[PDB]
UniProtKB/TrEMBL annotation, chain A:
Family, as annotated: Belongs to the formate--tetrahydrofolate ligase family.
GO molecular function: ATP binding; formate-tetrahydrofolate ligase activity
Residue positions binding ATP: 60-67
Gene name for this UniProt entry: fhs2
NCBIfam families (UniProt xref): PRK13505.1
Pathway listed: One-carbon metabolism; tetrahydrofolate interconversion
PROSITE patterns, A to Z: FTHFS_1, FTHFS_2
CDD domains xref list: FTHFS (cd00477)
UniProt-recorded name of the protein: Formate--tetrahydrofolate ligase
Single biological process term from Gene Ontology: tetrahydrofolate interconversion
Amino acid sequence: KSDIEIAQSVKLQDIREIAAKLGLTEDDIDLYGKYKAKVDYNLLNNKKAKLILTTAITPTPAGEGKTTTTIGAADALTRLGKKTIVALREPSLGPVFGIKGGAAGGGYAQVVPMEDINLHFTGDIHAITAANNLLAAMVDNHIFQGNQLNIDTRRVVWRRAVDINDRQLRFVIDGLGGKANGVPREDGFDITVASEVMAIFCLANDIMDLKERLAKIVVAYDREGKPVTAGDLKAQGAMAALLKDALKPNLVQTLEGTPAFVHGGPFANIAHGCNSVIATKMAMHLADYVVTEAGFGADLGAEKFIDIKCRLAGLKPDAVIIVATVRALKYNGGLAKADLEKEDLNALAKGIPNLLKHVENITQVFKLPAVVAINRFPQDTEAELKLVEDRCNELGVNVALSEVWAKGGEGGIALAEELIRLTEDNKASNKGLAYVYELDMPIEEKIRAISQKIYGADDVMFTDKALKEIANLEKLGFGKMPVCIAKTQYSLTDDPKKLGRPSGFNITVRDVSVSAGAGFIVAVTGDIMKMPGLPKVPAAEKIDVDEKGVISGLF
Amino acid sequence: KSDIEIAQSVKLQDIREIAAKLGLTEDDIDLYGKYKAKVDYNLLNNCNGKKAKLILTTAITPTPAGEGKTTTTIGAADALTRLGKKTIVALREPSLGPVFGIKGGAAGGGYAQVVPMEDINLHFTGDIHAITAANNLLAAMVDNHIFQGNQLNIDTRRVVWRRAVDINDRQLRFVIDGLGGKANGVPREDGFDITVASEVMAIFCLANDIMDLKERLAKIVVAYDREGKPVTAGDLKAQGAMAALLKDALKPNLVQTLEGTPAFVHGGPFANIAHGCNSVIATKMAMHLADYVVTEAGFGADLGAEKFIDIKCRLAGLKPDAVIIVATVRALKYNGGLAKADLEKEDLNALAKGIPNLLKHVENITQVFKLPAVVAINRFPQDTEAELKLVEDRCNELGVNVALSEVWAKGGEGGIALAEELIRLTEDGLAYVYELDMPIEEKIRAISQKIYGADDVMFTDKALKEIANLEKLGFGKMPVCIAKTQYSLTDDPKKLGRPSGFNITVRDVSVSAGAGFIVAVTGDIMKMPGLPKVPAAEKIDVDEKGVISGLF
Ligand SMILES: [K+]
Ligand SMILES: [K+]
Ligand SMILES: [K+]
Ligand SMILES: [K+]
């Protein structure tokens, strides 16, 4: 019984009745069909919820069902009589046509309508694409019309975008055709959700902060090295006007009718891998418990959820879910696929340190309440689960068995109860929030602080190129903001083949740039794909529509 | 009072009420906010009309300062509604591009508007994004096929498909893509057009339903192989996915006039390289849901009206019941040589030198297309009683009445005389300029001689060769779409008046095999406008509440 079969076999509730559960009326929402609606963001200036973060262990090529657990947890809280909202990211449209689409969640833990969310949804990503490309066209128009700001054509760092998996646009030359048609320069397209516009869209408090952030975008450098901004080009009003409706969070729902926001969807390497701040804040204003998540494992996603999103937005998670599976741990202990359906306590024993490292980071470094969610598969023996529970309990952390894939909200009551226990009226902590690094430190000491404390690196090495880039960013006033580290998700090191809990290793930063409007430094550790390619046989080939307009072949 | 202020000062009816006027339940429509809806296209095949009376709004040869064809189009519909006739106005959705370069504008004007005006000028219901995505998906699939082995044996230098963005971006007119070594694609020359110039928009507009959409896309010629044979979107298995991307967009957008007349706004191709009409599915939907439908075509009757009949009506199987030809006194005086500025003071000489242009359009409609015509004049206050009488007198001598229209100032009240005449014209086989079985040259000669009044048509040696390749490849039974300047009946924009003793020169001929017509270019054709020195974008702004200002 497919995710698509499951999603189609369930009568969804009209979105006005889902909105009713949040005390929203016809006047608070803009409908986009029967099962989708945008919530006016002006509600946010007239108490707040407990915030739960769903993160996970180091990911495998397949998955650990993080998003599925994130949905399942919210459905469970709802059943226990808690007014709850699950907040998630919108997937980009590109992959749907290359390597198949997929569910928001899975099993009986989904957010729906599945088909619309995968396609145009409410048009957020299209608005973001238009804004990015307007900016680019305004940069080139300015150069063409006389280049008053003295932009060095070879130093425009702003890139164009489309939400299609198109390798042909990674490296291009545009502005050709003689003097009436542009001025030649090297350029390229990123997949829309990699644009700084998407990261900014997700870190904005409101429409005004969006506009002020957009204005700070560095689009190019002039001929003596000084940054030129979207503000210099007077683009920020037009971009924000283009993003006016998009920035209203999208209200949809779970298979059990828990209210749900789907909004924003940045990269989790070159950006912070979270859904939008405005949506998270909206959920906390309308509910008593909010469940959300961040991309990849807890070394990237949660680190950036806390040290970037929470920091700049002024939020604090009240508890963290660390998702794990017996399979993924045994893979981390070096068992190799196809050999993972059999019980192996030795292999599991060698995989647990990874989980423990992530639990240690959440409980000791970030100092947050935590529960471990094992997504129970059928072949998970009684001993294997007991083993995970014992090792976790020795750090003082509980394990909840999650069966939400198979049973929906009923399969995550134990997790939900633990989360209620963990967050029990004890907010306390006038302290504030524990971050990995402080803002006033130099860029290399933040990268070092993250690499050592979170990844468990001995140290971080820097190339001469990286070092020079850091120096010039310190000068230009960018030395006092969060640092986003772009590395592989499949390992705690920057070498993806190093599984388990690696030690006696370093990270190596090869490139450092600023997302000035987003408000963070991006530190790349090698190669980061910004535009995926279509396979030999794209999924598009088998996507069809019939006489009556029903789409087939997306899943 | 400005157009946006009027559009923001009128209290609009919930679109569900508007839908009810047409007998549509909750149920039959997808709401996009309180004042917009998409109507399900499965209501077509549904049952059986009982088709409406179809009214085509066209115009004289345009000047830079427009003649308000759209406003008259909206007003004739509002008038008809006030005369108790169940009416829908059908219009084109405008592209986003120009709004950020030279500021947007009303859908119509004055008290003859379709609204919400802001939404229509931005993302609306997202139709143009779906189109852009479909076009750009196909382009990605063409390149992927080449990158992955190139079974179809495409010549990389003969990929004629082009990418799309709805931004006025001259930087993308001419590009090289597929650079960065073997891992990043295959080098070729390429470029973007503005989205609404893509064949996907023309096909979007000519499709009868979702199955006709899919089958038209399959026939898109994306490239040629190394031995001259066309490769298609169908060969790439792209048509299903393109249609999936366009599944919702293809449902017509139901909105309203200021007075609450049901309006469709849907589709919007060029009127030079394409046919300049709103979508067939929206017109057909309107003719199904109503008794009168008022719609329009881009530019003057030599371009828009010619193609509305010879391309849209031919392929869609429609027949207009009457034609409105819009003109103004100022426009005619301009066309009779009077050089701007003075287009304010009376000048019965210059008017009499402009009128022939009008009479040529009237002749083409009433004698060549053999259709009931009415000339509607958008009366300005500075128009003298004698100027207006001279236009009426010259028109009455050909058998055509003149209705004074003041729908700009007075709304539907100002189009009563026009509407009453339309009722009279529609109470008291379609004639095409050419037959499909004629060769391409002869079809181009037919339009040029009968409609523009040219002596003959000249072709370059390149055009003759291109034409011949299309004849042999089996594209010779298709309608022909002549792309040329709108500001003149010739292909020289300077030639105002009713020019005599001229020829047209066809310099380039290609095919939109999906859309089903040949495009014949006669001069420079700008498919991607650029931004001015100071883009309108610079003064567009949004406040903490999320109100946009500076858009108009
Ligand atoms: K999507
Ligand atoms: K560049
Ligand atoms: K538009
Ligand atoms: K080309």
